[PDB]
Design a protein around this ligand. Structure first.
Ligand SMILES: [Zn+2]
Lengths: 120, 96, 55, 68, 69
RNA sequence: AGGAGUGGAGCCUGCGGCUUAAUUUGACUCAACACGGGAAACCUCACCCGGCCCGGACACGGACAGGAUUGACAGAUUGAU
RNA sequence: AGCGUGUGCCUACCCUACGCCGGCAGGCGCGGGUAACCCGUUGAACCCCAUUCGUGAUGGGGAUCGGGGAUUGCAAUUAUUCCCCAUGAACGAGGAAUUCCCAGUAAGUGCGGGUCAUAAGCUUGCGUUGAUUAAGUCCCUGCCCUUUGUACACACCGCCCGU
């Protein structure tokens, strides 16, 4: 029930505010990726992924597009999505939160099983 | 082996002038260094000369990273048959 | 495209930018004075370079 | 060999017949009447036609799409 | 009182974004809602903090002997 | 006779064991264990999950310019235009 | 102080002074060097001088942990690296056992090379300061030699007796 904000501004403003100030809103590591240049040397799949998140289904559960990417910086443009990133074998499904922003998608997916121990 | 025609006859005419060429072993190299005037590969070139090895027209030595090819007189008359030239021009190896 | 996907990892940097100039293996390279050639072939052909046993 | 994962077969181009006889229209006169629009670019020659799709015509080695 | 902003310990907080200091109880509280924030957002750092293992990305095979009995 | 120590505490690295879809393998007293010049984010890679290309030179026999096949576009499709 | 290193066939990654911005890591211009010339008189560390500290797990020790900022690269999450502020655990000189060492030697320091796009807790060298103890033994631990016995020669992991 509590309102959500990111450094004093609200999610409608986040979808209203653009990249040249999203760099100063975000941290130094995130903005260094944004300030490196165009997303076309290798990030053509990133461009088609933001298009595939820009296409809008009607009011139901959000569309499922599995991905082979773990170095994605998640943006406010595709919050509330339905996505599973590649883990080497399968796809871990995580519903996109509004506090989900600011991190990596491959950070939020577990890859190795937690280690159990029986008898040596 | 979906290789073109004009590049191969360019290789053949530069073979008929001098019957020896050198080529380094590098599959990941799209351009020949000596034949920089036109767009030619290298892997198709070395596959063409190992096809000439399978036919029995040259002999092959590989020293460090470069393939070496040597022209034979039976290879010379094969070049004369394939290029259809009269027997009046000879490669410069036999000349003085 | 296979012809455009065949070179997707550039070899501008890293260990893959160079290999041995004799045995063509990417281990034990000597970048000092631009030898760019592995240590065992270095020991095999070190006498032919001019390298001597003095120390 | 036949493994657990089935192998998708390669694109078997079906051998069509009388295709080269399908370019121009045969009439009483000797004039030509082709059903494919010509290629005005310099990448593909003047004798190179387009494709015959349902909506838009496509080049060959030019790989150029001219919409309407 | 004209101090530099970079000299503070906590800069650009996720709640407000303004530069400020923190108190001892405030530091303990801020660390603890960071703890269940990571636990409820279900991240790898949150699971590592929940299991009590190394979260900064180091080896554990030889070191870290005082983890449990 | 001594000196510096190690083995004790924390930290880096290797091996064994456990775990893992995979935790690739060699090396077990001197004479293996900061060794393979091996400080592995991607290539390294030899390990697992996934998808294409042939790089089947060729000898013979079925097919031949009337076509033996590669290179691609609205869109389901992994992972990619 | 001294070994050094310093712009590349494939190849594109060189070493830097000077002048501004910023606490800082770093950012932009500005020259030199294919090298005793330019970095560089390589103003290195240790040590010395003058305060502060006062036997208290403490101003020792900096493991662990949160946030912010910079560079490399297509990409840093399973922190690549660095900088700044907070966080201050174990540790009061370590049992059995065990290693290296005779003069510029051990040891305390720092600097180069390899590793290297980013790069040293590893290794190889360089340099500073610089000792205690001994000119012997076979006790331990191994090696070597002589003599002696052999019914052993594939050689004690040997040959060989009886139920
Ligand atoms: Zn065309």
């Amino acid at each position: 029930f509590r309102k959500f904000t990111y450094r004093g501004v609200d999610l409608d403003q986040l979808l209203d505010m653009s990249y040249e100030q999203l760099m100063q809103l975000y941290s130094a590591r995130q903005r260094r990726r944004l300030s490196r240049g165009l997303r076309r040397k290798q990030h053509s799949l990133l461009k088609r992924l933001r298009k595939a998140k820009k296409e809008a289904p009607p009011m139901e559960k959000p569309e499922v597009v599995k991905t082979h990417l773990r170095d994605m910086i998640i943006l406010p443009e595709m919050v509330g999505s339905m996505v599973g990133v590649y883990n080497g074998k399968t796809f871990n499904q995580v519903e996109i939160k509004p506090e989900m922003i600011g991190h990596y998608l491959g950070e939020f997916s577990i890859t190795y099983k937690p280690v159990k121990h029986g008898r040596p | 082996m979906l290789m073109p025609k004009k590049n191969r006859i360019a290789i053949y005419e530069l073979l008929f002038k001098e019957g020896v060429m050198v080529a380094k072993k590098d599959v990941h190299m799209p351009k020949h260094p000596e034949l920089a005037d036109k767009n030619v590969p290298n892997l198709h070139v070395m596959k063409a000369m190992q096809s000439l090895k399978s036919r029995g027209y040259v002999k092959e030595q590989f020293a460090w990273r470069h393939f070496y090819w040597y022209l034979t007189n039976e290879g010379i008359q094969y070049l004369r048959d394939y290029l259809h030239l009269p027997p009046e021009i000879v490669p410069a190896t036999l000349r003085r | 495209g296979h012809q455009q996907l065949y070179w997707s990892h550039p070899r501008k940097f890293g260990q893959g930018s160079r290999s041995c100039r004799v045995c063509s293996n990417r281990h034990g390279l000597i970048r000092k004075y631009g030898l760019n050639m592995c240590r065992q072939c270095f020991r095999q052909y070190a006498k032919d370079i001019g390298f001597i046993k003095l120390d | 060999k036949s493994y657990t994962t089935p192998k998708k077969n390669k694109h078997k181009r079906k051998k069509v017949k009388l295709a080269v006889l399908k370019y121009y229209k045969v009439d009483e006169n000797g004039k030509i009447s082709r059903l494919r629009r010509e290629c005005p670019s310099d990448e593909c020659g003047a004798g190179v036609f387009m494709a015959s799709h349902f909506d838009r015509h496509y080049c060959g080695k030019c790989c150029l799409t001219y919409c309407f | 009182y004209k101090i530099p902003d970079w000299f503070l310990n906590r800069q650009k907080d996720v709640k407000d974004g303004k530069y400020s200091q923190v108190l001892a109880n405030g530091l303990d509280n801020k660390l603890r809602e960071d703890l269940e924030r990571l636990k409820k957002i279900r991240a790898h750092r949150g699971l590592r903090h929940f299991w009590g293992l190394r979260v900064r990305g180091q080896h554990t095979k030889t070191t870290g002997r005082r983890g449990r009995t």
